[PDB]
Structures are given as C-alpha cells and as structure tokens.
C-alpha cells in the first residue's frame, strides 16, 4: 500500500522545483518525507525486510504449530532461524566483550602487583 501524508502536512515546491514537506502542527519544514520513517532503512546496517533467506520456508503443523523448513539442508526445526541468528550473533558479541573486560582486568592487575608486592617488604 502507498502511505498518505499524516494529518496536517503539506507538500510545497521550491524555486528549484524540489519537493519539501510542511508540518503545520509543529510549524516546521523539511526535505524529508515524513513517511520515510517507515519505509526507509534507518542505518546503513538496517534492512526493513525480514524475509526468510533463500531455501527457507514457513510451515504450519496442526499438532505442533508453526515451524520452519530448510531446503538447503533437508532439515526442519521449530525455532525461527532469524531469531536464532540474532541470538547467537548477540551471544558471540556479548562474550567477546566479556573477554576484553577480562584482559584489561588482568593487565591492570599485573601492574598493581608490582606495587602491592613491593609494599609487603616494608612489613619485615
């Protein structure tokens, strides 16, 4: 479907003849189509589309419910592969993060040791 302009917006033309958008409610103007927020990626890493990738299929079993077929690998599974992707993507980063924290924690420690050790000597 083609979205219509939200309530109380207006198109206008520049001298140039370019289109811009008048938002009367807020007494503002813009080069940006307001419905672009729904139809445009919001980042060079964003995709609006959540299509299953080539070879995957949605399926419904009356006993078991929704499930997914992977024709690439002659496989079926319950879990949305998209969801499991995002999960194990995140789990990858979330512990890649935690090792870096472990690293600094140690290296900060290895120099705190050179001081703390020199300290106990006085206690003699």
């Amino acid at each position: 479907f083609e979205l219509p302009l939200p309530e109380g917006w207006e198109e206008a033309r520049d001298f140039d003849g370019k289109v811009y958008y008048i938002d009367h409610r807020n007494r503002t103007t813009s080069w940006i189509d307001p419905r672009d927020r729904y139809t445009k990626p919001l980042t060079f890493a964003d995709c609006i589309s959540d299509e299953l990738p080539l070879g995957w299929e949605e399926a419904y079993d009356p006993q078991v419910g929704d499930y997914f077929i992977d024709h690439n690998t002659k496989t079926t599974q319950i879990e949305d592969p998209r969801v499991q992707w995002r999960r194990e993507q995140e789990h990858m980063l979330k512990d890649y993060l935690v090792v870096a924290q472990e690293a600094l924690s140690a290296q900060k420690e290895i120099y705190q040791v050179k001081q703390q050790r020199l300290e106990l000597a006085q206690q003699e």
Binding site: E10, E11, A12, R13, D14, Y20, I22, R27, T28, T29, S30, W31
Partner: peptide, 18 residues
C-alpha cells in the same frame, strides 16, 4: 571536486508554493 553546499528548505514562517 567540491560538492554543492547544503541548502535548507524554506522556513515555516513565510510564503510557500503549494
């Protein structure tokens, strides 16, 4: 080369071709 400089749209207060 050099790109054309940024142009803002006509400000709200003022005349508009609609």
């Amino acid at each position: 080369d050099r790109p054309p400089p940024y142009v803002a749209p006509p400000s709200y207060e003022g005349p508009h071709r609609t």
